[PDB]
Amino acid sequence: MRDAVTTLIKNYDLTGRYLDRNAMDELKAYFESGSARIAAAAMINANSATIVKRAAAQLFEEIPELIRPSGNAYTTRRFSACLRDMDYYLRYASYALIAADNNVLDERVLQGLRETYNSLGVPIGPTVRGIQIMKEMIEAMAEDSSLNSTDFIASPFDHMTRELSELSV
Amino acid sequence: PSQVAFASGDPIPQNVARRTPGPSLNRFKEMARQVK
Amino acid sequence: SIVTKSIVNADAEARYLSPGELDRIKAFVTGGAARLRIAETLTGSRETIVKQAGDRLFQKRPDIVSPGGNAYGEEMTATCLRDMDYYLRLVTYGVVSGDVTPIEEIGLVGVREMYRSLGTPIEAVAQSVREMKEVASGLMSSDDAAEASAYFDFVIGKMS
Amino acid sequence: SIVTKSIVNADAEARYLSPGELDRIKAFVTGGAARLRIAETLTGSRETIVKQAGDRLFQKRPDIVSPGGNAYGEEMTATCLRDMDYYLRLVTYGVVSGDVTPIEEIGLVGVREMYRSLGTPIEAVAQSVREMKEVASGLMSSDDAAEASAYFDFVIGKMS
Amino acid sequence: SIVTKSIVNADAEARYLSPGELDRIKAFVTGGAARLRIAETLTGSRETIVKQAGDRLFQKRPDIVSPGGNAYGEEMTATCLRDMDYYLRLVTYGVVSGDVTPIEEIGLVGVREMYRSLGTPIEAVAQSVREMKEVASGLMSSDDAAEASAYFDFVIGKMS
Amino acid sequence: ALRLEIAETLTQNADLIVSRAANRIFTGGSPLSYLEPIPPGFRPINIARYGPSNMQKSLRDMSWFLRYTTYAIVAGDPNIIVVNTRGLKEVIENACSIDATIVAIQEMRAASADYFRNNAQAKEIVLQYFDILLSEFKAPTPANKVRQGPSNDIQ
Amino acid sequence: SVVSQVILQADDQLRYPTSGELKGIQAFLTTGAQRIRIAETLAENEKKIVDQAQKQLFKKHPEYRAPGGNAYGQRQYNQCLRDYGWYLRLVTYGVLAGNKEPIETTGLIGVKEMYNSLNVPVPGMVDAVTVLKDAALGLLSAEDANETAPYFDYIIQFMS
Amino acid sequence: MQDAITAVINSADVQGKYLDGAAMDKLKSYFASGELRVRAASVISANAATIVKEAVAKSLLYSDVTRPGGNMYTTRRYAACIRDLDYYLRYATYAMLAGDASILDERVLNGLKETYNSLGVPISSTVQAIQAIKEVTASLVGADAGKEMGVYLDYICSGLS
Amino acid sequence: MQDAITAVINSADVQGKYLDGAAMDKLKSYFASGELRVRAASVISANAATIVKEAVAKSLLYSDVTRPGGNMYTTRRYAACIRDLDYYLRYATYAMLAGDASILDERVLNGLKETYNSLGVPISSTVQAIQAIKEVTASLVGADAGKEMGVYLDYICSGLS
Amino acid sequence: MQDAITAVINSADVQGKYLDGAAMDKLKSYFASGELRVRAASVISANAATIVKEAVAKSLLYSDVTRPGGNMYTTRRYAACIRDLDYYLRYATYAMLAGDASILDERVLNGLKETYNSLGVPISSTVQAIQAIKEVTASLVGADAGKEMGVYLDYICSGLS
Amino acid sequence: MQDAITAVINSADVQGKYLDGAAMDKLKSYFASGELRVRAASVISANAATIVKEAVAKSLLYSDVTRPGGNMYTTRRYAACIRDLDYYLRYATYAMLAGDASILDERVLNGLKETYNSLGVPISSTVQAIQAIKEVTASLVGADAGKEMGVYLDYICSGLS
Numbered sequence A: 001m002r003d004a005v006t007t008l009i010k011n012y013d014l015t016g017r018y019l020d021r022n023a024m025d026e027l028k029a030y031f032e033s034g035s036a037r038i039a040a041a042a043m044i045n046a047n048s049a050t051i052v053k054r055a056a057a058q059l060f061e062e063i064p065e066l067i068r069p070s071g072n073a074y075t076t077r078r079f080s081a082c083l084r085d086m087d088y089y090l091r092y093a094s095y096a097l098i099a100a101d102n103n104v105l106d107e108r109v110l111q112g113l114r115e116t117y118n119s120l121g122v123p124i125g126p127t128v129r130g131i132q133i134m135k136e137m138i139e140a141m142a143e144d145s146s147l148n149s150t151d152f153i154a155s156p157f158d159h160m161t162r163e164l165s166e167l168s169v
Numbered sequence B: 001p002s003q004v005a006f007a008s009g010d011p012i013p014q015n016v017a018r019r020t021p022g023p024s025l026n027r028f029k030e031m032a033r034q035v036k
Numbered sequence C, D, E: 001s002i003v004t005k006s007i008v009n010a011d012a013e014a015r016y017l018s019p020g021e022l023d024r025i026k027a028f029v030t031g032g033a034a035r036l037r038i039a040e041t042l043t044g045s046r047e048t049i050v051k052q053a054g055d056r057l058f059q060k061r062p063d064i065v066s067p068g069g070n071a072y073g074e075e076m077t078a079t080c081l082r083d084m085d086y087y088l089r090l091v092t093y094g095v096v097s098g099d100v101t102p103i104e105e106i107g108l109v110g111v112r113e114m115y116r117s118l119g120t121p122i123e124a125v126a127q128s129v130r131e132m133k134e135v136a137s138g139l140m141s142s143d144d145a146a147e148a149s150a151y152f153d154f155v156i157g158k159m160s
Numbered sequence F: 001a002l003r004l005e006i007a008e009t010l011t012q013n014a015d016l017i018v019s020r021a022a023n024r025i026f027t028g029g030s031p032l033s034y035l036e037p038i039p040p041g042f043r044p045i046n047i048a049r050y051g052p053s054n055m056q057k058s059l060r061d062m063s064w065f066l067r068y069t070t071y072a073i074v075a076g077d078p079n080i081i082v083v084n085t086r087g088l089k090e091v092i093e094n095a096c097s098i099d100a101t102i103v104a105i106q107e108m109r110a111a112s113a114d115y116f117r118n119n120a121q122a123k124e125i126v127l128q129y130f131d132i133l134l135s136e137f138k139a140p141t142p143a144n145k146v147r148q149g150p151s152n153d154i155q
Numbered sequence G: 001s002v003v004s005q006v007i008l009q010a011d012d013q014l015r016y017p018t019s020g021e022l023k024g025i026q027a028f029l030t031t032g033a034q035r036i037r038i039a040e041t042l043a044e045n046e047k048k049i050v051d052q053a054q055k056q057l058f059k060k061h062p063e064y065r066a067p068g069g070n071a072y073g074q075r076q077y078n079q080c081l082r083d084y085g086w087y088l089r090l091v092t093y094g095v096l097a098g099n100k101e102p103i104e105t106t107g108l109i110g111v112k113e114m115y116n117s118l119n120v121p122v123p124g125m126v127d128a129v130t131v132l133k134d135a136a137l138g139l140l141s142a143e144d145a146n147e148t149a150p151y152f153d154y155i156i157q158f159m160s
Numbered sequence H, I, J, K: 001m002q003d004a005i006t007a008v009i010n011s012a013d014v015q016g017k018y019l020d021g022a023a024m025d026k027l028k029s030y031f032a033s034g035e036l037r038v039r040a041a042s043v044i045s046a047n048a049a050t051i052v053k054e055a056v057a058k059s060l061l062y063s064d065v066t067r068p069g070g071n072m073y074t075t076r077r078y079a080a081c082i083r084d085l086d087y088y089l090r091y092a093t094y095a096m097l098a099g100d101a102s103i104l105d106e107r108v109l110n111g112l113k114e115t116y117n118s119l120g121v122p123i124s125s126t127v128q129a130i131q132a133i134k135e136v137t138a139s140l141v142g143a144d145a146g147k148e149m150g151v152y153l154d155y156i157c158s159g160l161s
């Protein structure tokens, strides 16, 4: 994987450039926001399972057919598979928030999702909808918490949505 | 002898229910009820 | 990056980030300011550091610059200095990242094979990096010199 | 978006954006606040605009809910209203983005082929879009009603 | 045996026996009395079966008994009859076990190379097992002879 | 064949069995208003207190339990019941009473037994499959397999 | 401890610990004083903490003490309190070690089936861990509580 | 491509032989089945669009595939799905008339799985739609013609899978 | 893989209801044919080597396939073709006893075309061999079970085509 | 391995003799008791977790091994011990269904004693847990099945000793 | 290509719901940046040729690339290199206006790597040239607009990597 520091290092190494003033500024910005990143990661670590449960317990009401027959969460086996996928999404969002980079989000989540989900018949729309619901819950929880900076939290879930979604337009 | 005629015989046709709107369109169903 | 290592260690067990790894991340983020100070000193002194280290190397090991040596000739000397600059830049990357992973990935994987192919004494290259370490540690405080010494020593070990 | 259309035309002609195109983008970025206002108004009247438009459409074309029609039964009428809402949402997206392309790529391209398979009357759907347009004009100011009516009329023409 | 195979499969799958496997074990146990009766008939008619099979085989394949073959005088014929009796007893063991596991374990593996080492034609031994099969089937009732045939033909195929 | 008659019979009065379970389990009204032996400590559930959506979920789940019991009997193995029941207790306890579920399942088993009661070779299988269902439902949700990453490369 | 993690990673890579790992070990050695302070504060204030946690948990879960529960006997209520004491002891051990390894190897791995074999509800025990962590945080100072909280959070994660 | 007659002819040709007894037997069997094949082809041609309509209705309507975010949500995507089903129906009809599945490989299956993989299309969902197409065709075609059409549709499903 | 039982239950569950009127019809037909199909499978298992023997004798032996330059020329290729014939017979038995060819799809037709095209196996020769296998099995087991196995054998043949 | 039937067959075969009267009536007894063995095994498999739970509850709950310092204290060690007990139960069920005790030496008693000695596992407590499993299974299945199960359980305990 | 507006609407439509407050937040942010984006675009459009002239002078001119034996030696290859620099600047302007590099992924970085590989284009030289273009553009357009443009220029460079 590559965090923000690693990706900036790779970018400058590509042209064989020493770390210039803009590179130092971006590094300083990441290093100053690291406290808020760690705080948000601690919060999501504390409330991970409950957040995923709430996300599903809103998503299945948004899309009732995912628990009705022929939906892809019908069984308890299917329901646990859906919960495992959403927990995967939350864990990788935590990882991406601490890393300040979506490279992990691509390397270990998105690089085969459409292949796997199409192979299993699993819908790729309700998945991103549940991801966005998780992001909204996370943002509300962080805003309630004493987090001075919270704009970065929307980045990983938004990248998940953009990469795993269908190109409607 | 003819009891083994499971697949070679005439297949037993099944019934597939036509798909119908579900709870994801409850708002529109209620809108239709009130537009009645 | 320490962030990379901690996130990878967490994912290898499939858990969220452990308290110890979060502690390590917080320490890394706090020390980032000193990291950038060291890195900026290194990049600002890149010309002087490389020049002085090259002079020290060409004095201690005149064989490499004498005729029949790998660095003999104006172009070969310039290329040796350019390699010194490359390793100084990798040192800066490691300083900023708080580890030696960028140095490993860019300029310490297969370096032995590459320098064998080019005909260079890997011990001479390690000596050049050691002199770069000495010159750079002469240009900063005690703690910062000890901090950069870790990356310099890592390069020395990987080369020899 | 209007930016996307200008970029596409400029790329097709292999040239930078025209000064007039840049001026149009400038005006659009300035009027973004107003267009967001119209979008919010439509989103507020979402559950009533489509309802009233369906009222008018059913009173104009009783065959739709009459026996043998494409939307006979409450379930089919609800599906008709869901298409109603989909078209209003497309109009919202179009007025927000300033371009009809988000409208066309979701609910205009191949729509006749898509609805032939369903047996629905394309002319009926166009009349429905018309009725939605009058409902919006009622629940909208004067000028912004014309601004949204441009996109509504585009949808109406491309569908009917 | 069926029970042996069930236990082996259960270990390989790491769990107890399924309801269907228990059902098949129960059915095998119920039919065990019948199969034991079958083996009782076979062991009652063991001597005559071997004698008739041997003389029929000698008549049908004179090369084995004629000069140049493995049947010379009395000692070679006695050894062949001992082998035939061994195979009849193995078939009886398979009948009582309900599975060809005892036959395979005692003798079905390496029989090809063993008869190759001894010069015995494996086709001839399979033929002799065949005539044992017809003689036993004639000596027993038709429906009874079904399972005896289902084991004899397995032995013949393995010895083909 | 016998499994088929079992399935046909249970499907024949699935409504009756679920109704007689629901009336026994829930108190304060008619559980069947909007249908879609060892009671440890339970308390009957008020219909109005539980609410429309929750009661709908519970009724659907009881009928579904009967449906998979018939499916498993037809298939011949309790694998479907085990896979769909071994973890459901935890996911259900959050807003659904395990005691009420247990008594409803026992009611279903007793109803099936009394209604069919044909033969041990025809009824002991039904008894076995309800017993497996109850054991799986009483079992707490097991821990997950964890394929740990072999190294830093693999998640 | 973090020393153990660093040395294990170095052994796995077949190399010495890196600069970042060494600095993390140094930071943990520095923070050992506050680790110790965690140790004495928790050890000497367990009793009130455990009593408050048990009373709050059983108020939220009036089943285990109630009929149809798990802690009818005083032997079972004492067992639940003993589990609190053991969990908080493990939390102190983990905080002193700096990472989660003592908790993982003493009361985390396999604890789900641990309490499934005893019919103790895992959600009930995770709620108990939540209330215990809340009591400990309330009884500890703000920075001290912030340092101690992640270990309890990770225990909650592993429980469920 | 090649029908059954073409297959027998090509086998005899490649062996450089005249049509022997076995080739005559195979040709006679195809000639026996020919009238039923023609009847089924005419029926399916009469009811082409309808069969696809009820196929999607039993399979993909009001589903996650046709919800927003699915691969069949947009009007253009739905038209593309309908076009795929139209090709599948027409080519299964052609294969049934020819008595051979070689036409499917020549036209449809030679690159179609790579096509859907590059398109992101769900092979499981498309297989479900084709499976529904099987019964919707069987209803209008009969029993043995239904079996033949189902065989060719199963070939399509195997190619996609 | 799957069988008729699981296919019926899957259809029933996806429709959401119990096995009402035709699921049990198909299930009772399957159970009725079960004993005869099991006997046929036992006979085929006993006669496995023989059936391959007569099939190869009828179709492949004394042909350009076996002669030099043919894909069944060398001893290793002969053994591979025989092993493939045993594979076809075994999976035909599996499909017969499971009531569905989904085992054929997942285990036989998953990469059959790829492997055979990559190797160079004559598709027509393999189809003729499988037809000979089907005829031998039908003769050895009876017309009823012969056809019952022949449906899956012909499914494999069509997949090859 | 072997079972009752396999063992009697081997006993006859070592002398190379046909099935005599003793082998006959031993097979009769095994066949008669097969139904009882199947019933007991089915009950044990149906309630398998409960036997281990109750055996540990009446054997090592609130005990010194569960106390810290023992080999049963930590959650990981407790899970390993319960897994060992469950596998011992399953192997006892396999032995009872078989009618022969060779399976235990085959799969379990090869190295469990010495491996527990290497790991410092208390063999006496292991034997006590095995005995408690004996009473639990005897109570759950019945005295007739209880003695038959306890024979193999005692074999396991003696081998571990 | 997807700009910021179409990206937000796409994220909305794949969810099926109208633009909530967050969507309007993103749109207002984009419109706020729009004036700076348009100013930078107009300045770059006016100074199109001059920027490429300065970049070529800074990086490629009087080098081995432009001397004989270099890929920028022949007049036709010089003109092609200049046209490529014009592509990079224009598509950087497009990405700047749209707030995304989607157009870069669709058109610029779409087969570019192996296109240059087949043609023999020096990847490092072209990357250095793109960096010179970025530097000149930043100097000519301002610190903030220069950084914003350099984001897309660096995206193109890293893609070429």
Ligand SMILES: *[C@@H](C)[C@H]1/C(=C/c2[nH]c(/C=C3N=C(/C=C4\NC(=O)C(CC)=C4C)C(C)=C\3CCC(=O)O)c(CCC(=O)O)c2C)NC(=O)[C@@H]1C
Pocket: I060, I061, I062, I063, I066, I067, I073, I074, I075, I078
């Ligand atoms: C004396 C040689 C024995 C004997 C021979 C025999 N062989 C066949 C038939 C075939 N023999 C082969 C063998 C090979 N083909 C190859 O390409 C290779 C390597 C070069 C070998 C070893 C094959 C393939 C056949 C099949 C027929 C065909 O060629 O198409 C027969 C006829 C068997 C029958 O019933 O058809 C015979 C008689 N027979 C004996 O008894 C001698 C011990």
Ligand SMILES: *[C@@H](C)[C@H]1/C(=C/c2[nH]c(/C=C3N=C(/C=C4\NC(=O)C(CC)=C4C)C(C)=C\3CCC(=O)O)c(CCC(=O)O)c2C)NC(=O)[C@@H]1C
Pocket: I065, I070, I071, I072, I073, I076, I077, I078, I080, I081, I082, I084, I085, I087, I107, I108, I112, I115, I119, I121, I122, I123, I125, I126, I129
């Ligand atoms: C008669 C069968 C034709 C024939 C056969 C032939 N096959 C091969 C090689 C292979 N066949 C397979 C096929 C399968 N293996 C499986 O496991 C399955 C499902 C159970 C199938 C369908 C495979 C995988 C191989 C290669 C690997 C292997 O050894 O199994 C050959 C050999 C080709 C070669 O030259 O290497 C041959 C000759 N040949 C004919 O002429 C008949 C038409």
Ligand SMILES: *[C@H](C)[C@H]1/C(=C/c2[nH]c(/C=C3N=C(/C=C4\NC(=O)C(CC)=C4C)C(C)=C\3CCC(=O)O)c(CCC(=O)O)c2C)NC(=O)[C@@H]1C
Pocket: A057, A060, A067, A074, A075, A076, A077, A079, F053, F054, F055, F057, F058, F059, F060, F061, F062, F064, F065, F068, F084, F085, F088, F092, F094, F095, F096, F097, F098, F100, F101, F104
């Ligand atoms: C409570 C006394 C009754 C009850 C109510 C209830 N259930 C849910 C949610 C779910 N129930 C299920 C059911 C099943 N899963 C299966 O695999 C099968 C067959 C074995 C069944 C019957 C599932 C999957 C869910 C979750 C998805 C859903 O919404 O259906 C709720 C809602 C809980 C919540 O809102 O969070 C309620 C109130 N279920 C019972 O079993 C009791 C009889």
Ligand SMILES: *[C@H](C)[C@H]1/C(=C/c2[nH]c(/C=C3N=C(/C=C4\NC(=O)C(CC)=C4C)C(C)=C\3CCC(=O)O)c(CCC(=O)O)c2C)NC(=O)[C@@H]1C
Pocket: D064, D069, D070, D071, D072, D076, D077, D079, D080, D081, D083, D084, D086, D087, D106, D107, D111, D118, D120, D121, D124, D125, D128, H060, H061, H062, H063, H066, H068, H073, H074, H075, H078
């Ligand atoms: C209402 C004004 C008219 C009408 C509507 C009607 N539509 C359907 C079914 C569908 N309509 C669509 C259309 C769209 N889906 C999209 O995603 C888009 C853009 C966002 C459009 C335009 C689709 C795809 C369907 C299929 C149903 C499904 O999604 O499952 C019906 C019912 C069809 C049926 O068979 O049930 C009806 C009645 N009918 C009229 O008569 C009105 C004029």
Ligand SMILES: *[C@H](C)[C@H]1/C(=C/c2[nH]c(/C=C3N=C(/C=C4\NC(=O)C(CC)=C4C)C(C)=C\3CCC(=O)O)c(CCC(=O)O)c2C)NC(=O)[C@@H]1C
Pocket: G064, G070, G071, G076, G077, G079, G080, G081, G082, G083, G084, G086, G087, G106, G107, G108, G114, G118, G119, G120, G121, G124, G125, G128, J060, J061, J062, J063, J066, J067, J073, J074, J075, J076, J078
């Ligand atoms: C109290 C919070 C909950 C509760 C407690 C409860 N526990 C038991 C039995 C045991 N608990 C343990 C504990 C541990 N095992 C380990 O390996 C560790 C980690 C280091 C711990 C903390 C053990 C060993 C047992 C069994 C052996 C023993 O007690 O010595 C019970 C007994 C249940 C019964 O007797 O049926 C109970 C009740 N019960 C609740 O409801 C609370 C949520």
Ligand SMILES: *[C@H](C)[C@H]1/C(=C/c2[nH]c(/C=C3N=C(/C=C4\NC(=O)C(CC)=C4C)C(C)=C\3CCC(=O)O)c(CCC(=O)O)c2C)NC(=O)[C@@H]1C
Pocket: K060, K061, K062, K063, K066, K067, K073, K074, K075, K078
């Ligand atoms: C002199 C008659 C005119 C003139 C010349 C001039 N040229 C340059 C710079 C370059 N000229 C070329 C041209 C070519 N390179 C080739 O390989 C070929 C084809 C075989 C041609 C025609 C190139 C590539 C350059 C770039 C510089 C470089 O070589 O690296 C200059 C200098 C421009 C500057 O400012 O650097 C000049 C002056 N100028 C006139 O006014 C005369 C009419």
